[PDB]
Antibody
Framework: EVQLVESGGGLVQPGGSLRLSCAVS?????????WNWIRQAPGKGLEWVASITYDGSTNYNPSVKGRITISRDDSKNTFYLQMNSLRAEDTAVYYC??????????????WGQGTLVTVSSASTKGPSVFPLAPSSKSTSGGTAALGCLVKDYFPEPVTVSWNSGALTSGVHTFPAVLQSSGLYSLSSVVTVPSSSLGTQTYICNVNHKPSNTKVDKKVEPK | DIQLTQSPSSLSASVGDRVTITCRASQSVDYDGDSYMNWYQQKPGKAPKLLIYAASYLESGVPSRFSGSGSGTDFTLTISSLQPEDFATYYC?????????FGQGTKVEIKRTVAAPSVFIFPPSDEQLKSGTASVVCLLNNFYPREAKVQWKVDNALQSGNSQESVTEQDSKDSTYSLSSTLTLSKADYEKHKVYACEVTHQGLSSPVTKSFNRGEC
């Protein structure tokens, strides 16, 4: 089926420029009525910023127009977003999206996964990963909690999985908090049978793409 | 531009109850009989999902409990019977004129029965301590409602200003929340004290729950 995969996200200095790409698979980009960029500032609502129709006609939201370019490359089945003179206001998750051939066209049924662009002067920083060791011993031999503490990184985001994605049940990965250091900290926990602590291996897989930091942390009884 | 205002901005309803969300547009989004209003559902960490287009058409693959109505400047999204899976922020969007604009969004939560949190406390790892900092973490797992109070105590001294907390979005599995609180101390301060306690207050707890450990003993 049709899939939109975005690239080019991450840290950008103020005054700098961004280049995002939306690689389309399972569908010819030339068959879409239109392709669009829509962004969402952290904790805020949605803002359409640009579109390109099948014939190449472009359109922009005046709220950003004059420093923005949408374009496509048919032979790569990809379309692009270029913005320059970035401000803090431009920090957002950017989505690519497809318009429709029907019913007024400009509603969006197919979306990319979104990629975060952070406009900041700070530099990238990889996280430290520390174990949140379970129990010491169980309470009544019932349910134990263990986890990973992902501390002191910049910018967002980090992804955490458990046992390479084979452990999803009982997993909670919390929103990062911004420390006064200006660095983010996040915890991921999972609740498991306390009778499995001796026989089952639990590994949190942490990925911080902006700093090219990947960590696999085995967490076990201390 | 066309400004969209949703109401309410936030709501909580018992599972299975009818939910209606309204959208008022500053100008008409009507065009030749049609009304170009659309509705989206956005779940945590995901792209918006198209529910309704042209005011009243159900998008392919979307459950029939979602329906849309209205015309001109006034529109309604209806969830006939709210399901646990329906926790999300809902957006209206006009497609009548560029720039295509969205409502500010409506947060929908399922109001389930009161559930007390399971509380866990974690000492800092030896690994972290050599870095000169100690993080003490307290976990509140699977509770409702979202409101909860965490008090940190170090040798019975109430800690204030040196902790931060984070709450998960509502879990559709059971409509509960989880909360993580982190107490941050210097290594030196951590080594000066023995008893580290996390005291939790919540509606589902008849009296506060305290989890603690003594530094050194593990």
């Amino acid at each position: 089926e049709v899939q939109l995969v975005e690239s080019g996200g991450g840290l950008v200095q103020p005054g700098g420029s961004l280049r995002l790409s939306c690689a389309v698979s399972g569908y010819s980009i030339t068959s879409g009525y239109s392709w669009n960029w829509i962004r969402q500032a952290p904790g805020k609502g949605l803002e359409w910023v640009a579109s390109i129709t099948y014939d190449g006609s472009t359109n922009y939201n005046p709220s950003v127009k004059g420093r923005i370019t949408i374009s496509r490359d048919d032979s790569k089945n990809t379309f692009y977003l270029q913005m320059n003179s970035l401000r803090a206001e431009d920090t957002a998750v950017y989505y690519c999206a497809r318009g429709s051939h029907y019913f007024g066209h400009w509603h969006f049924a197919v979306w990319g996964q979104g990629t975060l662009v952070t406009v900041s002067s700070a530099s990238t920083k990889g996280p430290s990963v520390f174990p949140l060791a379970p129990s010491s011993k169980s309470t009544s031999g019932g349910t134990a909690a263990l986890g990973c503490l992902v501390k002191d990184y910049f910018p967002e985001p980090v992804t955490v999985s458990w046992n390479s994605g084979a452990l999803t049940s009982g997993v909670h990965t919390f929103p990062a908090v911004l420390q006064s250091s200006g660095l983010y900290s996040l915890s991921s926990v999972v609740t498991v049978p306390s009778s499995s602590l001796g026989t089952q291996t639990y590994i949190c897989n942490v990925n911080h793409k902006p700093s090219n930091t990947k960590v696999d942390k085995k967490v076990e009884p201390k | 531009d066309i400004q969209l205002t949703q109401s309410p901005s936030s709501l909580s309803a018992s599972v299975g109850d009818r939910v209606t969300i309204t959208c008022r547009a500053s100008q008409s989004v009507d065009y030749d009989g049609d009304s170009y209003m659309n509705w989206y559902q956005q779940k945590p960490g995901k792209a918006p999902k198209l529910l309704i287009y042209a005011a009243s058409y159900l998008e392919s693959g979307v459950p029939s409990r979602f329906s849309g109505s209205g015309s001109g400047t006034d529109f309604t999204l209806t969830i006939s019977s709210l399901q646990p899976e329906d926790f999300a922020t809902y957006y209206c969007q006009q497609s009548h004129e560029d720039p295509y604009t969205f409502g500010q969004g409506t947060k929908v939560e399922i109001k389930r029965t009161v559930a007390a949190p399971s509380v866990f406390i974690f000492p800092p790892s030896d690994e972290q301590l050599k870095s000169g900092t100690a993080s003490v973490v307290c976990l509140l797992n699977n509770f409702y409602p979202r409101e909860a109070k965490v008090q940190w105590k170090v040798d019975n001294a109430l800690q204030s200003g040196n902790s931060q907390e984070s709450v998960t979005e509502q879990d559709s599995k059971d409509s509960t929340y989880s909360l993580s609180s982190t107490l941050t101390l210097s290594k030196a301060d951590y080594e000066k004290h023995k008893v580290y306690a996390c005291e939790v207050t919540h509606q589902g707890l008849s009296s506060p729950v305290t989890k603690s450990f003594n530094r050194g003993e593990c």
